[PDB]
Design a protein around this motif. Structure first.
Motif, PDB file in Angstrom:
ATOM      1  N   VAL A  25      79.220  40.007  30.881  1.00  0.00           N
ATOM      2  CA  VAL A  25      79.263  38.594  30.526  1.00  0.00           C
ATOM      3  C   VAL A  25      78.335  37.822  31.452  1.00  0.00           C
ATOM      4  O   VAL A  25      78.339  38.038  32.671  1.00  0.00           O
ATOM      5  CB  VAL A  25      80.696  38.040  30.601  1.00  0.00           C
ATOM      6  CG1 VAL A  25      80.726  36.577  30.174  1.00  0.00           C
ATOM      7  CG2 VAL A  25      81.634  38.877  29.742  1.00  0.00           C
ATOM      8  N   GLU A  26      77.541  36.925  30.872  1.00  0.00           N
ATOM      9  CA  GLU A  26      76.688  35.998  31.593  1.00  0.00           C
ATOM     10  C   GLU A  26      77.125  34.566  31.296  1.00  0.00           C
ATOM     11  O   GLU A  26      77.708  34.304  30.238  1.00  0.00           O
ATOM     12  CB  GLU A  26      75.215  36.184  31.202  1.00  0.00           C
ATOM     13  CG  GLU A  26      74.908  35.873  29.747  1.00  0.00           C
ATOM     14  CD  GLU A  26      73.439  36.046  29.409  1.00  0.00           C
ATOM     15  OE1 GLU A  26      72.681  36.540  30.271  1.00  0.00           O
ATOM     16  OE2 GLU A  26      73.041  35.688  28.280  1.00  0.00           O
ATOM     17  N   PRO A  27      76.860  33.611  32.203  1.00  0.00           N
ATOM     18  CA  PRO A  27      76.146  33.756  33.477  1.00  0.00           C
ATOM     19  C   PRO A  27      77.032  34.164  34.654  1.00  0.00           C
ATOM     20  O   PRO A  27      76.509  34.427  35.736  1.00  0.00           O
ATOM     21  CB  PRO A  27      75.578  32.356  33.704  1.00  0.00           C
ATOM     22  CG  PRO A  27      76.606  31.460  33.106  1.00  0.00           C
ATOM     23  CD  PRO A  27      77.176  32.199  31.917  1.00  0.00           C
ATOM     24  N   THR A  28      78.347  34.214  34.448  1.00  0.00           N
ATOM     25  CA  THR A  28      79.268  34.514  35.534  1.00  0.00           C
ATOM     26  C   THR A  28      80.511  35.181  34.961  1.00  0.00           C
ATOM     27  O   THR A  28      80.707  35.243  33.745  1.00  0.00           O
ATOM     28  CB  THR A  28      79.633  33.247  36.319  1.00  0.00           C
ATOM     29  OG1 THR A  28      80.430  33.593  37.458  1.00  0.00           O
ATOM     30  CG2 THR A  28      80.411  32.279  35.438  1.00  0.00           C
ATOM     31  N   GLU A  29      81.354  35.686  35.860  1.00  0.00           N
ATOM     32  CA  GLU A  29      82.577  36.364  35.450  1.00  0.00           C
ATOM     33  C   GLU A  29      83.558  35.373  34.837  1.00  0.00           C
ATOM     34  O   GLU A  29      83.729  34.254  35.330  1.00  0.00           O
ATOM     35  CB  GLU A  29      83.226  37.069  36.642  1.00  0.00           C
ATOM     36  CG  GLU A  29      82.344  38.100  37.331  1.00  0.00           C
ATOM     37  CD  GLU A  29      81.423  37.493  38.375  1.00  0.00           C
ATOM     38  OE1 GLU A  29      81.285  36.251  38.407  1.00  0.00           O
ATOM     39  OE2 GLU A  29      80.840  38.260  39.168  1.00  0.00           O
ATOM     40  N   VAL A  30      84.216  35.795  33.756  1.00  0.00           N
ATOM     41  CA  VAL A  30      85.139  34.942  33.023  1.00  0.00           C
ATOM     42  C   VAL A  30      86.454  35.679  32.822  1.00  0.00           C
ATOM     43  O   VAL A  30      86.534  36.906  32.924  1.00  0.00           O
ATOM     44  CB  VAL A  30      84.566  34.492  31.659  1.00  0.00           C
ATOM     45  CG1 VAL A  30      83.277  33.699  31.850  1.00  0.00           C
ATOM     46  CG2 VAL A  30      84.339  35.695  30.753  1.00  0.00           C
ATOM     47  N   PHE A  31      87.492  34.906  32.532  1.00  0.00           N
ATOM     48  CA  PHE A  31      88.805  35.419  32.199  1.00  0.00           C
ATOM     49  C   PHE A  31      89.095  35.205  30.716  1.00  0.00           C
ATOM     50  O   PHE A  31      88.571  34.268  30.107  1.00  0.00           O
ATOM     51  CB  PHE A  31      89.893  34.735  33.038  1.00  0.00           C
ATOM     52  CG  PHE A  31      89.920  35.177  34.473  1.00  0.00           C
ATOM     53  CD1 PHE A  31      89.154  34.528  35.427  1.00  0.00           C
ATOM     54  CD2 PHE A  31      90.712  36.242  34.866  1.00  0.00           C
ATOM     55  CE1 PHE A  31      89.179  34.935  36.748  1.00  0.00           C
ATOM     56  CE2 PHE A  31      90.741  36.652  36.185  1.00  0.00           C
ATOM     57  CZ  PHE A  31      89.974  35.999  37.127  1.00  0.00           C
ATOM     58  N   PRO A  32      89.913  36.056  30.105  1.00  0.00           N
ATOM     59  CA  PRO A  32      90.200  35.902  28.677  1.00  0.00           C
ATOM     60  C   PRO A  32      91.144  34.739  28.419  1.00  0.00           C
ATOM     61  O   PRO A  32      91.865  34.272  29.305  1.00  0.00           O
ATOM     62  CB  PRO A  32      90.855  37.235  28.305  1.00  0.00           C
ATOM     63  CG  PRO A  32      91.537  37.647  29.565  1.00  0.00           C
ATOM     64  CD  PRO A  32      90.623  37.211  30.682  1.00  0.00           C
ATOM     65  N   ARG A  33      91.133  34.277  27.171  1.00  0.00           N
ATOM     66  CA  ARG A  33      92.051  33.227  26.751  1.00  0.00           C
ATOM     67  C   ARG A  33      93.490  33.714  26.858  1.00  0.00           C
ATOM     68  O   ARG A  33      93.839  34.783  26.345  1.00  0.00           O
ATOM     69  CB  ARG A  33      91.735  32.801  25.318  1.00  0.00           C
ATOM     70  CG  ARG A  33      92.629  31.701  24.774  1.00  0.00           C
ATOM     71  CD  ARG A  33      92.166  31.273  23.391  1.00  0.00           C
ATOM     72  NE  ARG A  33      92.044  32.416  22.493  1.00  0.00           N
ATOM     73  CZ  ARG A  33      92.982  32.803  21.640  1.00  0.00           C
ATOM     74  NH1 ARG A  33      94.115  32.134  21.508  1.00  0.00           N
ATOM     75  NH2 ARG A  33      92.777  33.889  20.901  1.00  0.00           N
ATOM     76  N   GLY A  34      94.326  32.928  27.533  1.00  0.00           N
ATOM     77  CA  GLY A  34      95.706  33.290  27.770  1.00  0.00           C
ATOM     78  C   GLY A  34      95.986  33.878  29.134  1.00  0.00           C
ATOM     79  O   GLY A  34      97.153  34.154  29.443  1.00  0.00           O
TER      80      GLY A  34
END
Ligand SMILES: C[C@H](O)[C@H]1O[C@@H](OP(=O)(O)OP(=O)(O)OC[C@H]2O[C@@H](n3cnc4c(O)nc(N)nc43)[C@H](O)[C@@H]2O)[C@@H](O)[C@@H]1O
Ligand SMILES: C[C@H](O)[C@H]1O[C@@H](OP(=O)(O)OP(=O)(O)OC[C@H]2O[C@@H](n3cnc4c(O)nc(N)nc43)[C@H](O)[C@@H]2O)[C@@H](O)[C@@H]1O
Ligand SMILES: C[C@H](O)[C@H]1O[C@@H](OP(=O)(O)OP(=O)(O)OC[C@H]2O[C@@H](n3cnc4c(O)nc(N)nc43)[C@H](O)[C@@H]2O)[C@@H](O)[C@@H]1O
Ligand SMILES: C[C@H](O)[C@H]1O[C@@H](OP(=O)(O)OP(=O)(O)OC[C@H]2O[C@@H](n3cnc4c(O)nc(N)nc43)[C@H](O)[C@@H]2O)[C@@H](O)[C@@H]1O
Ligand SMILES: [Mn+2]
Ligand SMILES: [Mn+2]
Ligand SMILES: [Mn+2]
Ligand SMILES: [Mn+2]
Lengths: 371, 371, 371, 371
Positions: free
Chosen positions: D148-157
């Motif tokens: 994932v770009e541009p940075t680390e993300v968390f999933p919905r929920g």
């Protein structure tokens, strides 16, 4: 005299009310300005033209004609659709056409006598030394002029904080100069009361027994828009206020003519004019309503009206005519919105007065564009 | 006989009402369970101990003693503070101690006769063939037993849709077996009417003229918690509902005893029991209230009450005693919450019935933990 | 030059921030106007007098002194209590006392260099041909002047509809006459971002690497009130807007300086002035916040900001000075409140602009009373 | 083997997505249950019959056929119209017809490989000693398996309170017995993140690099309904929760599958089953959304999710199969609704859990009526 009169009625019905409203209007030569809406059926235009052949001077401008008129006056967003607020279009149209008397009615108020228009022409007699009615508490109950069962009732828009102590108020009549510019006609059948009164006793106006009165300076009474004649000079102050603003998250409704009835009344007394109550009397077979829904709509406005009316007595107005007085009233409402205190005066409740004041100036700005 | 009676009153006042409530209670040997709150001053505890020296069996458990009792019964969050809902502690305490009669009163209802407790002991006479009052529409107006001015009024909690057609209802009396378990006493001075009625006519109950009646199977009437005796068997069904749930963003209030009055009445008729209205009569010099604030609090509950009462006649209940019947009633309310239709039934309005049903089982779960 | 500077900080803390804010202020001779509130502990006054002995010119007027000043200017209800809106008292006090530079800060922004006040004196250099920064999309991202991890961020109050396409915008520098009147200083540690950004990446400003820029006519960027110097001429347009108005039933907050930062910016460019971004840089050890609660407060304002900023570019202003320009801006906001369309523009959302505009004129009316 | 698979998709589009969804479904013999709504045009039915000629086992029951099925199961008001909640009809239909695997997808998730259905058949391999992934904090970030770009993300929920400390969590893998019953497939292009994350960084999933994992007992992760296979035994616990409940007057939305993903995950671990994340991977060209409107819809549910997930670890469930465990889960939610504390837990927020729990039992009551 040669007095011209225009009747303004906004409706979404099929036009069946014309069968009982046209005779009293065509016999006097008055004009009926019907204001349809987007959700109005095509049967209304067929009914207006059916009575147009019988001699009634009735006009029914389509929503396209209304929007073209409002757009030319730089007020396209002033009057919304799907609302009885569109009667302001009829107020504006009758005012541009130079009519002397503008009669505001609804599609369920029917004249009981043949001289309906003639009695409403009392707003053109000018100043004269006449008997005026004054009250010690500063309020007058127009329903006392009627025979109402099962018990005594107050009109819609009457302040609740003054109802218990109104019975012991002193009512006097004195010979005083007055200039009648607003004439609120009474109603038989279902009287104009708030949803609280109708849910409690279900009033029924039997007859008109009190006659007519002209209120003196300092004595007030709510004036509706279902049987009210307004002189063309006082018409700028008779703007039907826009409803739908949430107070404590509850959108208010059914009080558009309560504010206008009080606003044109406060403006009239500042300019040396008075309000008349009584004849002509109309039948009111009220449209079918959900009375609990009427209560749900009226509660947000009732919680604020008593404080508004009290601060209006403390705010002297300025202006030479109704245009200047009404705009001075709008700025007075904005000062009241910040000085008033109470549990019901949330930030959105105070903002209701600020947005209404801007819409009042937008209404006067459109009238100044015409003149 | 040897009937025991405990009076339940929750209050935040200084305790001055004990001067007019004690004489009729101490002369009958009844216990007064005063339930204070966090917003209750120390004058109440001093007033309870002052009348305790005079021979009044009055108890006033502190909020620490109440919370310890509720925590031991696995219900620490059932009854909130800063609310008259705390009277459920008195209902619980009077039921744990084995009192036959639990009389629910407020701190402004004062008995008028010496046999106040004796008349409330009618909920312990058992079944007997007695004249029962039935109505064609299934509703009875207990305010018709009073002399009310200026006009006829309905009690708080009476459905509005049945008020117009109630004048044509047929009232009959027949000798049928009945068992009285709830005795709703009447009130003089300020009658127990809703804010809509009090704001419209300001009723004043002058005298008690209608006597006493026992409603038959199928005839309902609202039962408040200000002058009501309940047999200890029907006490589990007399849970004072928790208020504060928003309907269209408006939190409901003042109807906690309206639901409990109907719930214990629906449960009683399923078990072969009946409700009595009439004596004993009390004086009700009601505390000072903002009537417009009472209206703002009651409107959310009024918009839903008519639909709830109608669907309760469609749901026959199950259960052998009041504990099983009340729990069966909670599940029926959750089925009504999804079957009912109407403009006022927003998602938060339906969720009010689901959360109330859980609080009803949390209540009966506490009683089952005791027994 | 001989430039006077007053630092305005409103706080409810104990005054421990003075131990790290006083050295940079007393070494430059600037005055610190601390604005306490009703819920401010008495330890703040003891801390202000503790640093008063060390040479810092710091004043801390009590809420009684503030209300007496606001009552003399006919604005007792303008600034509420229990709110950071009371910094307007410091804005007013510093403006009456004739200070050249008014520096708005918070109790958690700490200067990193000794020349903090000297760098903020750039709002007194007057007009000069200087390099100005322009953007093709009309927006500038001041956080691009910082080193932010883990990813690139936008400042609080930056329109969301312009963020995806801002990366491909053309940024140019040209030699143009400019008059710097507002200088927004950057922040290290926790940068000034909205709750959406802080909940998503938790930004951390490492260093200041972009230097300073002066935005040209037509290029905007949000300006906060935690490290911003405003010249006394532009101070009338720097009114911290009153929060707490419900949009769709949700009261807005945390955007009082977002509107003021944009309002004083739109007014400055109309009068031929510009806004500077960059030094002096301060440390921002932000106070502990509930980030989900910050989101709950900021959402009502975010849903409307993008439409407000777009219509402000279509509304040319009038006025010769900041007083006339700001009042012309208030009337422009009222015209925008009726022309704008969208799902989030409910009647209460439009009323937010009308009441804010009245409070803006009430702010300018108080300043004209002083002068 | 001979495993059966039915794909459940509800949509209001014209059916053009079938051109890219059919090839992978018709080559595996899987059934596509398309659930239309009242606001669905006639182009979907023509598109379903067009691909039915090409060999795709696709069914599209009209809203009349759906309502007849729900009415015969005594649940006519369980599933509302004009909502993506109608996918529960597809869950019910695929479960009645005896399909082993129920794959929940949306009309914008398109498979990238030919073995899409084959990879989703991992929920039918039974228990086996396999490497399971455990975390010290009890949470797993399935987006870490993506690029994932541009940075680390968390999933919905994903709970926000556990996001900062998640970087220091210890991730271990051990050979433990596990039984996979839910397979949450990953997504390329627009990853399944909340509106807060998408509004801040606009994530773009480039590739799948982390492979597949099977979470151990005590490690949770949100599971959506756009690319998720569920074994027919865990299908009763996969009820898509009904949205529209107001929290502080704001109706929640977009989290119907967030609760169902957690509920079926909590029920699976109680019964000795596990959840798998990874392949099959789909392309997600997400439909056009107003991100500020997505935020306004998700904030009410985000304010409560962290507290609900924390208290679910305090309530051990009961039951032998998913029907009994899911019903035991509904009663546990009602106990949490009264135990939980916080600013966001208004009376309507707690009532959301009570009504949702009743809808969960109304759901399982429909399944029990079928079987
Ligand atoms: C609304 C308040 O309730 C007001 O009613 C008054 O009298 P009222 O309470 O008795 O109601 P009623 O006379 O039946 O109708 C009042 C008239 O508005 C018209 N009307 C209704 N819906 C309309 C719509 O969408 N568009 C347009 N263009 N017009 C509409 C109807 O045709 C009636 O002619 C006052 O009480 C109060 O200010
Ligand atoms: C409130 C509703 O309106 C109910 O009133 C009833 O009669 P009512 O309308 O005449 O009101 P009233 O008799 O004055 O007070 C009713 C009694 O509640 C007590 N009380 C008031 N605030 C309290 C608080 O915070 N905590 C605690 N623990 N108690 C409190 C007062 O002391 C009274 O004893 C019904 O109508 C309706 O169920
Ligand atoms: C409110 C928004 O949140 C604003 O905060 C800004 O920065 P911020 O988000 O980082 O908050 P913060 O710097 O911690 O405090 C901001 C300052 O308000 C003071 N304060 C807090 N509660 C107060 C109260 O009741 N009375 C008075 N008189 N003052 C109070 C504190 O002492 C801080 O000095 C902007 O974002 C946004 O415009
Ligand atoms: C709504 C939430 O937001 C959910 O969206 C998910 O993914 P999402 O956020 O990417 O939205 P999306 O995939 O575009 O649509 C999701 C699917 O619902 C269908 N749909 C849309 N409006 C409908 C209506 O009125 N009736 C019926 N019957 N169906 C409708 C569409 O056709 C899509 O197939 C989850 O996030 C979240 O549970
Ligand atoms: Mn009418
Ligand atoms: Mn009382
Ligand atoms: Mn800060
Ligand atoms: Mn999608």
């Amino acid at each position: 005299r040669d007095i011209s009169t225009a009747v303004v009625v906004t409706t979404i019905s099929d036009g069946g009310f014309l069968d009982r409203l046209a005779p009293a209007l065509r016999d006097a030569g008055a004009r009926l300005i019907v204001i349809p809406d987007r959700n109005t059926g095509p049967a209304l235009f067929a009914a207006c033209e059916r009575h147009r052949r019988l001699g009634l001077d009735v006009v029914c401008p389509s929503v396209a004609e209304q929007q073209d008129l409002l757009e030319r006056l730089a007020v396209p967003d002033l009057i919304p659709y799907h609302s009885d607020n569109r009667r302001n279009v009829g107020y504006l149209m009758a005012w541009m056409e130079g009519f002397d008397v503008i009669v505001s009615m609804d599609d369920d108020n029917l004249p009981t006598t043949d001289d309906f228009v003639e009695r409403h022409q009392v707003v053109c007699q000018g100043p004269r030394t006449q008997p005026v009615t004054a009250s010690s508490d500063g309020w007058f109950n127009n329903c006392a002029l009627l025979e109402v069962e099962p018990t005594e009732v107050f009109p819609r828009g009457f302040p609740f904080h003054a109802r218990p102590a109104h019975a012991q108020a002193r009512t006097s009549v004195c010979e005083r100069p007055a200039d009648v510019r607003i004439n609120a006609g009474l109603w038989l059948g279902d009287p104009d009361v708030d949803a609280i009164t109708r849910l409690a006793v279900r009033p029924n106006a039997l007859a008109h027994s009190g006659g007519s009165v002209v209120l003196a300076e300092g004595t007030w009474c709510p004036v509706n828009a279902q049987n009210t004649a307004v002189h063309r000079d006082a018409l700028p102050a008779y703007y039907f206020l826009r409803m739908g603003q949430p107070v404590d998250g509850v959108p208010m409704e059914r009080f558009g003519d309560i504010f206008s009835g009080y606003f044109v009344q406060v403006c009239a007394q500042h300019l040396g004019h008075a309000v008349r109550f009584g004849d002509p009397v109309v039948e009111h077979p009220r449209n079918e309503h959900d009375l609990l829904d009427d209560l749900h709509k009226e509660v947000p406005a009732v919680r604020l009206l008593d404080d508004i009316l009290d601060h209006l007595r403390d705010h002297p107005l300025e202006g030479g005519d109704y245009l200047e007085t009404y705009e001075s009233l709008s700025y007075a409402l904005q000062e009241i919105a910040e000085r008033v205190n109470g549990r019901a005066w949330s930030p959105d409740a105070r903002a209701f007065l600020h947005r209404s004041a801007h819409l009042m100036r937008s209404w006067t700005g459109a009238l100044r564009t015409v003149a």
